[PDB]
Amino acid sequence: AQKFNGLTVLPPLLTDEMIAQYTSALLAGTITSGWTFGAGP
Amino acid sequence: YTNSFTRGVYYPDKVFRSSVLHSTQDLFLPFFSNVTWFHAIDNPVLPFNDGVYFASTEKSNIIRGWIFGTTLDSKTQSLLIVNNATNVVIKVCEFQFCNDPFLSEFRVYSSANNCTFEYVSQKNLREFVFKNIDGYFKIYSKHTPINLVRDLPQGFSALEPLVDLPIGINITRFQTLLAAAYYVGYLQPRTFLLKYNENGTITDAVDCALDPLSETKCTLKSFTVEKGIYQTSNFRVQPTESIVRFPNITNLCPFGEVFNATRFASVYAWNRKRISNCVADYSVLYNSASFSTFKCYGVSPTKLNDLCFTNVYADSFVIRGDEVRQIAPGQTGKIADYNYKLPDDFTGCVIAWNSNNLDSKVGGNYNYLYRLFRKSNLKPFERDISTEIYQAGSTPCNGVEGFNCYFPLQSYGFQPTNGVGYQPYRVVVLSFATVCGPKKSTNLVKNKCVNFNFNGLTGTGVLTESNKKFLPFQQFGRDIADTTDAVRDPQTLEILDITPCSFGGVSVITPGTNTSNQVAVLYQDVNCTEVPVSTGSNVFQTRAGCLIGAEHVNNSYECDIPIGAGICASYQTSIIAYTMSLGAENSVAYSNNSIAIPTNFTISVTTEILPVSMTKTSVDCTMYICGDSTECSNLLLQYGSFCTQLNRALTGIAVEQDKNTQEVFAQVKQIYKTPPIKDFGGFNFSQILPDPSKPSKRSPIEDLLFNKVTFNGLTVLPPLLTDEMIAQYTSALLAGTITSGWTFGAGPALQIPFPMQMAYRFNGIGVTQNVLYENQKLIANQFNSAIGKIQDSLSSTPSALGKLQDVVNQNAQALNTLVKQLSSNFGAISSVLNDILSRLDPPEAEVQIDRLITGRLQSLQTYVTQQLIRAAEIRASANLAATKMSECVLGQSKRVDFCGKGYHLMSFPQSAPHGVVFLHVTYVPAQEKNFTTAPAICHDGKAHFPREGVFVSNGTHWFVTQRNFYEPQIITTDNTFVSGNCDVVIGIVNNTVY
């Protein structure tokens, strides 16, 4: 797992500060609404 | 001067091709290149580098011909083409040049000499192409109507071959003869991409090294590219200077006592000499006076004066001519066995010479003695000097020679009358840092990109002084995995580091061919400081790399083209780069005593597509590898049973692609039919039921789906079940689910009217049956509207059936690559077997056939291994379709999001060319409202709880309603149970119970 010799590592499309936002949104939705937000308004 | 607007293409070879794109790699005239506008109204001498483009335009026959040559004069061979009549002429003698060949004037050929071929035989542009390769002379031409005033028209048309000439005369000159327009251009090796039409004429072309868009087109093998990101080429930096640092000392090596020595020694007493601390000039020995030969093992004699060695050892001895062949590794003989032994890895040279004039005297010379037997073979580089009497028999001897005991040494009969096989010979062997060569030096550079040439070490890198603490005896520093990153100079004593040159990939971002024609490039993991000519006003640095050609904006969109690190690109209709936005901002007004309940609903339909099976293939071995040949088949039996295994694997794959269809579709024992009259309560099913007016007996949606998407020992097998049988199975399932509910998957089929079934399904989600019966017309209308929009949405953008198309494309790209691999040498002379045999005799024609067998065998194993991995992915998809059919078609599912987004009601299957399409029906609420709630009611010192519902309040009164649809009612003892007193619960309220 080193450089040279034509080996490269590409960065992921989504960072970690975005996965944190997604998981916070899911938590807020399940706390404040219940199971309703997954099947409509 | 003028440029060239896409002009000068010609037919490469004599092959007919139709409606196919091709890639060629020979000499052309690069697009948009500068040319010379010679005007004669004058004729100079122009060079000839690999090809010339010619053109002219005149209303009268001013242009006559050409005078080729290499050293044009009256002293060498030449070539002459002129047209002074209705005939042409060709000659290979000429040799009559002058300083003004302007020519019924014919003052060109003053003389003549040994002549050759006599092909004397039979405005507007007239373009020509001349090239001289492989000892043949070829020309091309075309004539077209034209009207212009200055340079050249637009458009293009290719040129066709005219003649050929096996001249063989080198050409390094070029002239012209007149009697207007006369252009000149040169040729260069490039790579193109040509398009043919049905009749077989070149009609378009694109270059590969003009612009990045052309590179993308060439790498994708198409003229139109859709939006996305692509990998095109690679990027690396070239060195600039050179460094040849070398040792300091200077002293000529002493070879006189080695090569020009006066008196030699005996072979059995060969001397050993050591040469060190010197600089040699080996090349002088390689010319000198050719002694006998210069056979060198391990190193090349020609490239010897650039290497530094650490110790040089030379041995000299005298032998005869016949024993010369024994001085080599892996040789046997008296000299090889008991006089001199060479190791099998000898890296040196052997020089010998005939010395009949110094080591031979009349009568024979007995000064030289050689050993002829010993107790054991000599080790390499071992000398024996003992002269003890050898015992060659059972009878012992003690220092006395005689019977069965002879002297170990014998003398040579070196007489001057002896033959060259018995004439004396002197042989010296060199067995190759201190002994360097005649090189030079150069000052050392820091922090630049150069290629270094140390003593036997070569490479490229950036040299920097580094804080590598060193024990004061070591030079070469290495990191993990054995990378050389430290050197010690041969002149000073300093420690450096070796770091490589920057490299990375290049990617191109495009918004589509039919949208615009501008691109942006992304140099991966490279800082925007080492990327010069590429250069522009827009240079932006990201985490992925350097982006050239896009601007930065401070507003967030929902992105389409991905780049990396949460950065995307788009088009404004002008390419912009920005940061992603996850979604809209929302917040629910949470409170301690507030609730929301819907007052209406909608019905939705959502589709889903799944692949099921792939195509069955079988490949024969002996036809693919050898092919109609009897000599090749014999050589393949010694490889064992490597071909039964492949057929077994492919057959195992093929059988499995026939139980997936059975597991998915064959789930009913009987075949059900729909009733003749269709009155189902207001619901219309004509878009999914089969029609009788069409021959295929398929529903309209199935018809739209089926219209939307579609040698060498390669075969394709047919499937077991046909499309008609699959259609019958689907129709049976639909009829059963319409006329019988869900009862036919768990026993006998039981009839039930459709609205009652729909009312049953409403009870499974939490809505009472009365809601359906009092809203029948609205639900029927919504359902009928939902079905009608599927056809239009599928008739929309063809990206709908993406999943099934990729299975067809992948299974066809792999089969094309396999056939194309039959036209490669794999390190041989020819790709066809009928020229290997018909040009070589069997003993060594067989080694060149085993090289084609190894390559053609491991190309088959790559094909079989990848097919197995792809057959494991489809079986996962097939097992997910069977589960969906049982749980979402033969029942009502309570699993969230398993089939549809919302609350499940029912589903219908439809058949696709290689998969299955589901149609999910789902309940969705709407039109919310606000209310106030309480958990319990206190009445006469008791606590009252709802049975199935929620307590609500309009502001002045209290009610009880169900949880999913607003329907208020009066609180009574019939819809309430009592438990405990009302001094424990939190949030209790006061009211009355009737």
Ligand SMILES: *[C@@H]1O[C@H](CO)[C@@H](O[C@@H]2O[C@H](CO)[C@@H](O)[C@H](O)[C@H]2NC(C)=O)[C@H](O)[C@H]1NC(C)=O
């Ligand atoms: C069920 O829906 C189909 C839609 O495909 C209806 O068929 C169309 O009906 C309209 C007017 O009723 C005609 O103009 C079209 O030509 C019909 N298309 C066909 C026959 O392919 C069908 O009438 C509907 N049936 C009921 C009972 O409502």
Ligand SMILES: *[C@@H]1O[C@H](CO)[C@@H](O[C@@H]2O[C@H](CO)[C@@H](O)[C@H](O)[C@H]2NC(C)=O)[C@H](O)[C@H]1NC(C)=O
């Ligand atoms: C809220 O809904 C109630 C439901 O009827 C209404 O308020 C009164 O309710 C009682 C019995 O529940 C009825 O006898 C009265 O006639 C209702 N009042 C009126 C003006 O109709 C009313 O619809 C709503 N009340 C308010 C204050 O908005």
Ligand SMILES: *[C@@H]1O[C@H](CO)[C@@H](O[C@@H]2O[C@H](CO)[C@@H](O)[C@H](O)[C@H]2NC(C)=O)[C@H](O)[C@H]1NC(C)=O
């Ligand atoms: C419901 O009604 C009862 C009366 O039956 C209320 O109880 C009274 O509460 C007040 C103070 O709020 C006391 O001074 C009285 O002595 C209580 N009377 C009895 C008989 O307990 C009760 O507070 C009411 N609750 C609500 C939420 O209105």
Ligand SMILES: *[C@@H]1O[C@H](CO)[C@@H](O)[C@H](O)[C@H]1NC(C)=O
């Ligand atoms: C050339 O192609 C056209 C259609 O593109 C066709 O009509 C014509 O017959 C062709 N000429 C031939 C086949 O000689």
Ligand SMILES: *[C@@H]1O[C@H](CO)[C@@H](O)[C@H](O)[C@H]1NC(C)=O
């Ligand atoms: C050769 O290099 C320099 C001359 O510039 C000298 O000072 C140094 O001592 C010499 N090195 C050797 C190994 O002779």
Ligand SMILES: *[C@@H]1O[C@H](CO)[C@@H](O)[C@H](O)[C@H]1NC(C)=O
């Ligand atoms: C609900 O919360 C409010 C404030 O958020 C506060 O009065 C109390 O915790 C609860 N109210 C009642 C009436 O229980």
Ligand SMILES: *[C@@H]1O[C@H](CO)[C@@H](O)[C@H](O)[C@H]1NC(C)=O
């Ligand atoms: C409910 O929605 C339907 C269409 O979605 C509409 O026609 C109707 O007026 C709405 N209200 C009621 C009470 O049905």
Ligand SMILES: *[C@@H]1O[C@H](CO)[C@@H](O)[C@H](O)[C@H]1NC(C)=O
């Ligand atoms: C009332 O309910 C509605 C339902 O969406 C909500 O938008 C609103 O914020 C609520 N108001 C209060 C005061 O709870």
